[PDB]
Every structure is written in structure tokens, then in C-alpha cells.
Ligand SMILES: Cc1cc2nc3c(=O)[nH]c(=O)nc-3n(C[C@H](O)[C@H](O)[C@H](O)COP(=O)(O)O)c2cc1C
């Protein structure tokens with residue numbers, strides 16, 4: 284019985300990894316994720332220049348999940364590129380590097396640089412489409428023309444297999460349109476479903492106050508709040524993109540949650556809120572919990588059940 | 597005591613009512629909601645003809661909320677009109693009637709007929725903008741030109757103050773666009789935020805199966821999953837629509853949750869999943885809990901704190 288996977292020409296001890304932005308910003312963070320029992324790690328979404336991000340408090344967590352408006356704080360692309368080219372030990376596990384340029388041109392500039400490193404070391408690119416474009420327009424993946432533009436330009440500039448990080452959708456017509464856009468791009472080999480459920484608002488009843496400072500307390504939601512939304516999006520893309528992998532992200536706190544993701548179609552399973560709260564020991568727990576479920580059901584490998592969610596009649 | 601308020605030229609004993617679709621479909625249901633301690637009731641969204649709705653099971657609930665793909669089962673507009681015109685006891689509490697035609701024409705035909713009953717009896721219209729719009733197109737509220745068409749035609753045909761039931765949005769540019777549309781229509785006097793969070797997917801780990809039959813298990817989410825989303829939409833529209841009321845809906849299980857909706861800007865608070873699960877006794881508990889929080893804080897009126905959520909710095 285085992286949790287091993289072989290995809291994208293890499294080998295993974297298990298399907299678990301951090302969600303971009305959690306425990307991935309500094310060399311310290313990335314060494315910690317490497318030392319953990321996760322099957323892979325992804326670096327913090329980066330921009331060409333270093334960013335401080337939004338004013339604090341900008342992340343808060345509660346029994347049912349988290350809210351954040353971090354504002355893309357990061358050490359800048361050159362730092363993440365150097366970690367991939369010079370510091371990461373690929374004998375431990377594979378590395379994804381997430382990029383999140385604030386314009387299509389910024390993304391093209393980073394991927395042009397990353398390509399030779401991707402080619403020579405095998406670092407894998409996750410392009411974040413659940414990011415701001417022009418203020419007053421919707422985020423890139425909610426503007427299908429912008430999304431197409433970004434994928435066209437990054438595909439041409441990078442020239443190698445990559446994947447994308449998608450926001451959640453809530454309408455079947457949007458699943459159909461979004462998947463059709465992605466299916467135009469053969470280099471998009473994995474789709475990560477999902478980024479945080481956008482612009483929620485947490486209010487503390489005792490203080491009568493929002494809990495994060497930026498954007499009048501509005502921010503993205505993660506954790507237990509978003510699991511059914513995550514599963515839907517994983518399965519919607521798994522069904523619509525049969526030539527791509529789907530990575531699941533959202534609401535994983537247990538091996539049972541990971542099992543549901545995998546039944547929905549997930550190949551890797553990312554852990555954000557629960558990792559931020561529990562720390563990297565979570566990975567051993569999740570491995571143990573998932574293996575226990577597999578033993579009860581007689582499943583020896585992930586492929587035996589991946590995507591095999593049953594529907595009714 | 598007491599929680600009495602005046603809105604839209606009607607007196608309400610308290611701000612609580614059912615959410616449309618819950619405990620409102622049959623004359624029995626409506627009689628039961630009338631007998632309750634709620635301050636108002638709203639009928640099941642209706643169509644011109646009666647509908648059986650989707651195959652069962654079509655609703656399921658869990659500790660964190662519910663998922664549903666009911667498919668608009670209802671007794672038909674003629675029945676809800678007759679209830680409004682002949683059967684409802686207006687001396688008990690106000691009545692809202694929810695309309696959810698499948699095209700703009702169908703809405704216009706129902707509202708033309710509802711208008712004289714509204715003038716005569718004071719029944720209030722809630723137009724459901726989650727009404728599905730041409731298939732392969734996004735629900736109407738997610739199609740801003742269709743939404744504007746709907747409201748233009750309903751406003752002309754109905755000619756009296758009404759409100760609208762809105763799906764959640766997740767992007768600030770969409771809040772700006774949607775609120776601008778609504779502000780084009782002076783007869784739209786209340787906005788109810790939110791309908792169910794669309795197309796989530798609940799999977800049962802033991803059976804490896806989705807839990808509702810329609811649409812391969814995909815359905816709208818309600819309950820604890822959606823409270824921060826509901827609060828965000830309530831506050832976003834409250835800020836953007838200063839000449840309208842905002843009704844809150846989503847995740848209310850307690851007087852504390854109602855308190856947060858009200859702080860966000862809610863005038864009435866609707867109760868869906870928790871009412872489905874607890875029954876109409878919930879209204880006395882909510883009342884008691886909300887009065888207990890007001891007492892502890894020194895608030896004597898709802899007006900003292902409605903919309904007064906604090907931001908940081
Ligand atoms: C503090 C924080 C920072 C994050 N930063 C990023 C980011 O830099 N890039 C990105 O793609 N997603 C980012 N996310 C989103 C997560 O990767 C993930 O998609 C989301 O939190 C949902 O998963 P969860 O329910 O496990 O938290 C961030 C989330 C949190 C809580």
C-alpha cells in the first residue's frame with residue numbers, strides 16, 4: 284500500500300504539499316518544507332521586485348478557516364529563482380515555483396528567466412491566475428479574455444509544461460468557459476483548484492470589528508468554509524480537462540478530506556490554512572490518515588480511486 | 597424587549613424571517629411560518645406553472661451546512677397569488693412573495709398580476725435574480741446586461757417598490773458593477789444578500805458518492821460554510837446602495853450570527869438551512885439570543901448598530 288505518484292516526469296513520495304503562500308516565503312520556510320514529510324513544496328507567489336505586502340493584521344484564523352489579504356508579500360523573483368537553481372535539494376522532493384506578476388508583461392519577464400532553470404533542474408512552474416490585473420477589473424481568471432492573453436504570452440515565453448492556480452467558480456457556464464480556455468493551451472499540464480474564496484468578511488462580535496486591516500476587512504477565505512467549493516472545482520475541471528492533471532487545494536485538514544479531493548480527481552493535494560495553523564507535522568498525520576482509509580477500503584494505490592467519485596442514478 | 601421595526605411602510609415585530617424556499621412551499625408551510633414568532637415570511641420562489649422540481653435526494657444537511665439542487669419545485673404562481681390575496685393573515689405579519697420565472701417574459705407576466713394584490717393587500721415582491729437564464733449562459737445576476745434587462749422590464753411592468761434576491765459575488769469589481777446596476781432602479785428598495793453559494797460538491801467518504809442526485813452532486817451551499825461570504829455581500833451592498841435596504845441571508849444559526857449580519861448592514865435577517873434543520877422554534881431562540889447580546893452591550897435599538905461594523909485604522 285503506498286501513496287507514491289509519478290507525474291510530470293517527477294516522482295513524489297505522497298500527494299501532499301503546501302498551498303502557495305503558506306510556509307513558503309523565506310529560505311527558512313522552504314528548508315522547513317523540504318525537511319517535512321510532504322511529497323513536494325511550492326514557493327510563495329512572487330513578483331519581479333520584492334514586496335512588503337499589505338498592512339497587518341492581514342491574516343486571521345478561526346475554527347472554520349481563515350481570511351487573508353496578504354497583498355503578495357515576497358522576497359522577489361530573483362530570490363525564488365536562486366532557491367530553485369542553487370539551494371533546493373531535488374533529491375529530497377520536487378519543487379514548484381509560483382509566480383504572480385501584476386501584469387502580463389511582468390509574468391513574461393519572469394518565465395523567460397525561469398525556463399533554463401526549469402529545463403536544467405526540473406523546477407515546475409505554477410502560474411497564479413487568481414490575481415489582480417487592472418484595478419476596477421476582475422481578477423485575471425474571472426476575465427476570460429485576460430486569462431487567454433496571459434496563457435498565450437506565458438506559453439510562448441516559457442515553452443515548457445506548466446500549470447495554473449485557479450480561483451473558484453460558482454456557475455456551470457463559468458466552468459465550461461474556463462476549462463475551454465485552458466484546453467486551448469497544451470503546455471498547461473496541471474490545474475490547481477482552488478485559490479481562496481474571494482472577498483469574504485469576518486466580523487468579531489465582541490469587538491464589533493472586522494479582523495483584518497486591508498480592504499475594510501474583506502479578504503480571501505480558506506479552510507473548512509471552502510471544502511465543498513474546492514471539491515466541486517476539482518471535479519468540474521477533472522471532467523472538463525481530460526488531458527491535464529488537477530491538483531486539489533481547499534479545506535484539507537485530514538486524510539479524509541484529502542481522500543475526497545482525490546475521489547474528485549485530485550493528483551496532488553495542497554494544504555494551506557491547516558498547515559498555517561498546525562505546522563508541518565500535519566504531513567505525517569495526513570499520510571497516516573489517508574493510508575488508514577485506504578487500508579479499510581482495500582485500496583493499495585491512489586490510482587485505484589482517483590476521480591472515481593460515484594454519482595447517483 | 598423589544599425588536600420591533602418599520603421598513604418599506606410595514607411594521608415588523610422583529611427582523612427575522614425564513615429564507616425563500618425553506619418552510620414556504622405549501623399552504624401548510626406558509627401557515628406554519630405565519631404561526632411562528634418570525635417577523636415576516638416569504639413564499640417559495642415561483643414560476644407561472646407548477647413544477648415538480650428535480651429528482652430526489654435533492655437536499656442534504658451536515659454539521660457545517662447544506663447542499664441543494666431542488667430545481668424550483670413550487671405550486672405555481674396562481675397558488676402563491678391566491679395565498680397572498682385571500683388566505684394570508686396580514687394582521688399577523690407581512691408577507692413577501694418570491695418570483696423566479698425562467699425568462700424575463702414569465703417574470704413580467706407574473707408581476708403584472710401581482711401588482712394589484714400588492715396595492716390592495718401590501719404583499720411585498722422579492723424577485724429572484726438567481727433565476728436561470730438561457731442555458732449555457734450564466735445565471736442572470738452573473739450577466740449584468742441580462743440583469744439590467746430584467747429589472748428594466750419588471751420595474752415597468754410592476755411599477756411598485758420591490759426587492760431582489762442576489763447570488764454572492766467574490767470580486768470587488770463585480771460588487772461595483774452589480775450595485776451600479778441596481779442603483780439604476782429606484783423601485784428596487786431592498787436587496788437580499790445572499791442566495792446559496794453556487795455549485796459546491798459534497799462527497800460522502802464512506803460511500804464514495806456524492807449526496808444529491810441532480811447535476812452529478814453539484815448544488816448550492818448554505819449554512820456555516822457561507823457566513824463570511826454572506827456578511828461580505830451584505831456589507832458591500834450596504835455601502836454601495838445607500839438609498840436601499842439590505843436584507844441578510846446566509847449562515848444564521850444564532851442571535852450572534854444575526855447580530856453580525858445587522859452590524860454588516862442588514863435590516864431583515866433571513867434564516868434558511870438552520871430553519872430547515874431546527875424548525876420554526878428557531879425564531880424564539882434567535883430573538884432571545886439577539887436581545888441578550890443587545891442587553892449585554894447596552895444597545896436598545898437595532899438602528900444603534902446596524903451597519904456600524906468597525907474597520908481597522
Ligand atoms: C496566508 C495565505 C497566503 C496565501 N498566498 C498565496 C499565494 O501567494 N499564491 C497563491 O496561489 N495562493 C495563495 N494563498 C491561497 C492558498 O494557496 C490556497 O489556495 C487557499 O488558502 C485555500 O486552501 P486552504 O483551504 O487549505 O487554505 C494563500 C492563502 C493564505 C491563507
Ligand SMILES: Cc1cc2nc3c(=O)[nH]c(=O)nc-3n(C[C@H](O)[C@H](O)[C@H](O)COP(=O)(O)O)c2cc1C
Nearest residue numbers: 615616617641790791792818819846847867868869
Ligand atoms: C432547500 C432550499 C430551497 C431554496 N429555495 C430558494 C428559492 O426558492 N428561492 C431563493 O431565492 N432562494 C432559495 N434558497 C436559498 C435560501 O433562500 C438562502 O439564500 C440560502 O439557503 C442561504 O441561506 P442559509 O445559509 O440560511 O441557508 C433555498 C435554499 C434551500 C436550502
Ligand SMILES: COc1cccc2cc(CCc3c(C(=O)O)[nH]c(=O)[nH]c3=O)ccc12
Nearest residue numbers: 328352353354355356413414415478479503
Ligand atoms: C487586496 O489583495 C491584493 C492586493 C495586492 C496584491 C494581491 C495579490 C494576490 C495574489 C496572492 C494571493 C494572496 C495574497 O498574497 O494576498 N492571498 C491568497 O489567498 N491568494 C493569492 O493568490 C491577492 C491579493 C492581492
Ligand SMILES: COc1cccc2cc(CCc3c(C(=O)O)[nH]c(=O)[nH]c3=O)ccc12
Nearest residue numbers: 641664665666667668669696726791792816
Ligand atoms: C439545477 O438547478 C436548477 C434547475 C432548474 C431551476 C432552478 C431554479 C433555481 C432557483 C431556485 C433556487 C433553488 C432551487 O429551487 O433549487 N435553490 C437555491 O438554493 N436557491 C434558489 O434560488 C435554482 C436551481 C435550479
